[PDB]
Design a protein around this ligand. Structure first.
Ligand SMILES: [Ca+2]
Ligand SMILES: [Cu+2]
Length: 639
């Protein structure tokens, strides 16, 4: 239920070694081409030495390695499955450096994969750190290593991909847990399938950037299969996850307690809706005909205080529908929603028509004009992305997508929308000359410096298929009104992929697939490390440190004073992100106007308008003159 990115390397001249092997289950039984023979570590009379266990391959010559695979025993024995693991490569066989991949594999007998950026190597080492259910042994029926067609060294200055994080699920939805710094991920009732769900179950997984540990959990307490949901971080600091496979349910993720809490049912059953946090910390949602029925699903609003959903039937979905050939099932999906001033929500697309949504009384909607430029009126851009990279100036960058959800050519179209007051038609212009690569199902994040990182997708949208993939990410730099290609990766990230900004300033990009017995499930993620973390020699740059903050919780309009260990030139606040199905209505950036107190002490004001400084958790980044950001300090913004 997955696949390698390369082609299997012939093994008939390989030499292998293992930390131990039972007689009859020798090390080389894992490479003899026989599914019924297997390597197994010591047991019985030779004792039961516990993991870590290690399998090392000498391929004799250099190969352009981009993955490996492990076929478990196929005789019903479950006690040697590899859980936590690391993959190492070497050119000399003695020094191995950092893992090219690490994480945790699901506990079953299916073939497991580690896919990673191509690297020339002669030696490959798999370390089984744990057995999947905590038993002493490791076994492998067949291990294979895969090679790419070629190898191209990354270009200096264009960032770096790696390592791979191996996961027990396909992470088609994800969020940062702001109080812990971990990445939260979920699939559906199964690790790679949503089809045939009985409801009431979500498999989740987390990755801790500080320890590298991948964990997992089965969530049933909210009686919610959270595949295909709306996602918003509300003003009470809880992630509101709505609908999807259980179309009327609301689940609340609480970062502080790392737990899921039941919420009230929505008034209208929805799937593939967007939701957006508002200036008052409430959550607005509209549309979503993927589940719960296909009909006009107007707005509704969630109050964290009263724990209620209230219908806003006059916040009409009709003005935001695309012209999708498939009709309403698609046309109300994945709105480009942004909470804004005075309880309003701006809808930037994907429909050509942009709209203001209002949340007083029973709701309202007002035309905000068409997304357009001197190049003409922008077509519908389903699963294009929208990123508010300067909330203070109302700036939204939009890009990509296709006129129909499926079987439709994506475009390079890109715009800058500049928001003013609710009820006014914003200025829209074309962004630079558009994307380098037409793409849909791509994902994106705003970076500390205000640039937008754009990655993945495919040129023609075909859910569950990894055709016409785009492997080269792009960064939009607003000050230059220019896009820049970055170094490419090796793993397709199209439908059901996610990206999030990490507190350490790197990008977490993963997922794709989630179609059960399909070959396109990606049980993994990769890190992109932007160029701003590297010095001129390609080594990791020294980062400025925030050595003190006057407070970590601030009201809108409030000031914060900070100390740094070195002089800084710029600072920004970036709201923590959530992601699924190309939608991320939680991220946004505020560039900060600094007062220099001298002696590397600075102060700034959080914007007084909570439609700009949307309540929730934010990352504070400072940047030195060289453009190197600190790691984030977490700030809670309230109103
Ligand atoms: Ca075998
Ligand atoms: Cu989906």
């Amino acid at each position: 239920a997955s696949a390698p990115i390369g082609s299997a390397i012939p093994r008939n001249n390989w030499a292998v070694t293992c930390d131990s092997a039972q007689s009859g289950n020798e090390c080389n039984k894992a490479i003899d081409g026989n599914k019924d023979t297997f390597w197994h570590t010591f047991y019985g009379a030779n004792g039961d030495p516990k993991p870590p266990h290690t399998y090392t391959i000498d391929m004799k010559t250099t190969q352009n390695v981009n993955g490996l695979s492990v076929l478990p025993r196929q005789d019903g024995n479950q006690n040697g499955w590899i859980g936590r693991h690391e993959v190492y490569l070497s050119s000399d066989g003695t020094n191995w450096g950092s893992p090219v991949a690490s994480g945790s594999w699901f506990a079953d007998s299916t073939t497991k994969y580690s896919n990673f950026e191509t690297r020339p190597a002669r030696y490959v080492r798999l370390v089984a750190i744990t057995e999947a259910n905590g038993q002493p042994w490791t076994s492998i029926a067949e291990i294979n290593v895969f090679q790419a067609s070629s190898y191209t060294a990354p270009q200096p200055g264009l960032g770096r991909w790696g390592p791979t994080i191996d996961l027990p699920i396909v992470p088609a939805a994800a969020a940062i847990e702001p109080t812990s710094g971990r990445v939260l991920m979920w699939s559906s009732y199964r690790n790679d399938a949503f089809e045939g769900s009985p409801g009431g179950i979500t498999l989740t997984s987390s990755w801790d950037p500080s320890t590298g540990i991948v964990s997992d959990r089965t969530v049933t307490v909210t009686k919610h299969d959270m595949f295909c949901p709306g996602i918003s971080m509300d003003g009470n600091g809880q992630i509101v996850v709505t609908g999807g496979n259980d179309a009327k349910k609301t689940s609340l993720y609480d970062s502080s307690s790392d737990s899921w809490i039941p919420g009230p049912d929505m008034q209208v059953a929805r799937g593939y809706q967007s939701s957006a946090t508002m200036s008052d910390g409430r959550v607005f949602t509209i549309g979503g005909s993927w589940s719960g029925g296909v009909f006009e699903k107007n707005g509704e609003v969630y109050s964290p205080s009263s724990k209620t959903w209230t219908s806003l039937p006059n916040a009409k979905v009709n003005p935001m529908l695309t012209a999708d050939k498939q009709g309403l099932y698609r046309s109300d999906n994945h709105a480009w929603l942004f909470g804004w001033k005075k309880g309003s929500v701006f809808q930037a697309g994907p429909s050509t028509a942009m709209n203001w949504y209002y949340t007083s009384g029973s709701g309202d909607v007002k035309s905000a004009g068409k997304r357009q430029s001197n190049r003409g009126v922008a077509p519908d851009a389903m699963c294009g992305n929208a990123v508010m990279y300067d909330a203070v100036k109302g700036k939204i960058l939009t890009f990509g997508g296709s006129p129909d959800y499926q079987d439709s050519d994506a475009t390079t179209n890109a715009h800058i929308i500049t928001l003013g007051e609710p009820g006014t038609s914003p200025n829209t212009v074309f962004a630079s000359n558009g994307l380098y690569f037409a793409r849909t199902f791509h994902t994106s994040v705003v970076l500390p410096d205000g640039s937008t990182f754009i990655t993945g997708g495919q040129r023609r949208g075909i859910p569950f298929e990894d055709s016409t993939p785009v492997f080269t990410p792009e960064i939009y730099v607003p000050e230059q009104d220019t896009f820049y290609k970055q170094n490419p990766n090796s793993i397709v990230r199209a439908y059901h992929s996610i990206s999030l900004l990490l507190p350490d300033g790197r990008v977490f990009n993963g997922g794709g697939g989630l179609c059960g017995d399909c070959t396109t499930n990606h049980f993994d993620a990769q890190i992109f490390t932007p160029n701003y973390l590297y010095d001129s020699n390609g080594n990791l740059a020294t980062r400025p440190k925030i050595t003190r903050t006057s407070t970590q919780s601030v009201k809108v309009g409030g000031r914060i004073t900070i100390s740094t260990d070195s002089s800084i030139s710029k600072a920004s606040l970036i709201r923590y992100g959530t992601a699924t199905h190309t939608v991320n209505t939680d991220q946004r950036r505020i560039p900060l106007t600094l007062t220099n107190n001298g002696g590397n002490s600075y102060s700034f004001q959080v914007p007084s308008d909570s439609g700009v400084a949307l309540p929730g958790y934010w990352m504070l980044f400072v940047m030195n003159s060289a453009g190197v950001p600190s790691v984030a300090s977490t700030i809670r913004v309230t109103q």
